[PDB]
């Protein structure tokens, strides 16, 4: 008896557009705390941790722990029919094999009613210890999006080098070389337009750009992205879901 009413469905819309392309099949663990997704990709290179919390929904009601097998492509298609101001209602029965989506317009005159198939879950949900990282950059999401797009033309790999004074992105492909460098902002009149670095040990890591573009697709959710990297451990691309959850992407270095 899962029933979640949320009024700004844009968020739920955006999340789908974020995760539609990276993960094909996912498993939503529904509990009395919130909706939690944690999955990998085909070749086990990246990891996605989505967490939306009970206090964010306008009406959360859960009875038993539900394990739903979702096809995020079909689901993204169904929420494509969702208005950005539409109110979305997730619903399911304690044992049902179908998830019900209800899109309802602010002016109570249109009620779209969709029902998606669930499938057999078979996911190994490993744990990722929330840890303390050597380098932690906190920048606007738009410029990170820029840099990833720009450097995606040069090569298939990026080299992030965090130091004491600046963050540096570097690519080197079959058609040349590229080096973008962002620096520390002082006192800018916008909290979400500032770059700040918290260094404890300079880091020198090599990642793949395709998955960074995948992660970049989640840009409209937050104005600020946080990168967290350290030697030999994965990079954490984190977007805040304003007053409700978090989205976390992880990548294993070269």
């Amino acid at each position: 008896m899962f029933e979640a009413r949320l009024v700004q469905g844009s968020i739920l819309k955006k999340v789908l557009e974020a995760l539609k392309d990276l993960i094909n099949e996912a498993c939503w663990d529904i509990s009395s705390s919130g909706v939690n997704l944690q999955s990998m990709d085909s070749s086990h290179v990246s990891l996605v941790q989505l967490t939306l919390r009970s206090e964010g929904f306008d009406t959360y009601r859960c009875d038993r722990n539900l394990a739903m097998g979702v096809n995020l492509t079909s689901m993204s298609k169904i929420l494509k029919c969702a208005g950005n101001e539409d109110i979305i209602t997730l619903r399911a029965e304690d044992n049902a094999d179908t998830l019900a989506l209800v899109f309802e317009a602010p002016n109570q005159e249109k009620v779209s009613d969709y029902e998606m198939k669930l499938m057999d879950l078979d996911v190994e949900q490993l744990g990722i210890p929330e840890q303390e990282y050597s380098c932690v950059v906190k920048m606007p999401s738009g410029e990170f999006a820029r840099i990833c797009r720009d450097l995606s033309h040069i090569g298939d790999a990026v080299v992030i080098s965090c130091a004491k004074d600046g963050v540096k992105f570097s690519a080197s492909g079959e058609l040349g070389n590229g080096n973008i460098k962002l620096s520390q902002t002082s006192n800018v009149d916008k909290e979400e337009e500032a770059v700040t670095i918290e260094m404890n040990e300079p880091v020198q890591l090599t990642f793949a750009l395709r998955y960074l573009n995948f992660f970049t697709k989640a840009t409209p959710l937050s104005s600020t992205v946080t990168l967290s990297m350290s030697a030999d451990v994965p990079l954490v691309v984190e977007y805040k879901i304003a007053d409700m959850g978090h989205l976390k992407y992880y990548l294993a270095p070269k």
């Binding site: 990998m40 070749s43 086990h44 290179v45 990891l47 490993l126 994965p234 294993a252």
Partner: peptide, 9 residues
């Protein structure tokens, strides 16, 4: 290389 993935967790 490509580390894949856990390998790390």
């Amino acid at each position: 290389r490509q580390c894949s993935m856990t390998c790390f967790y």
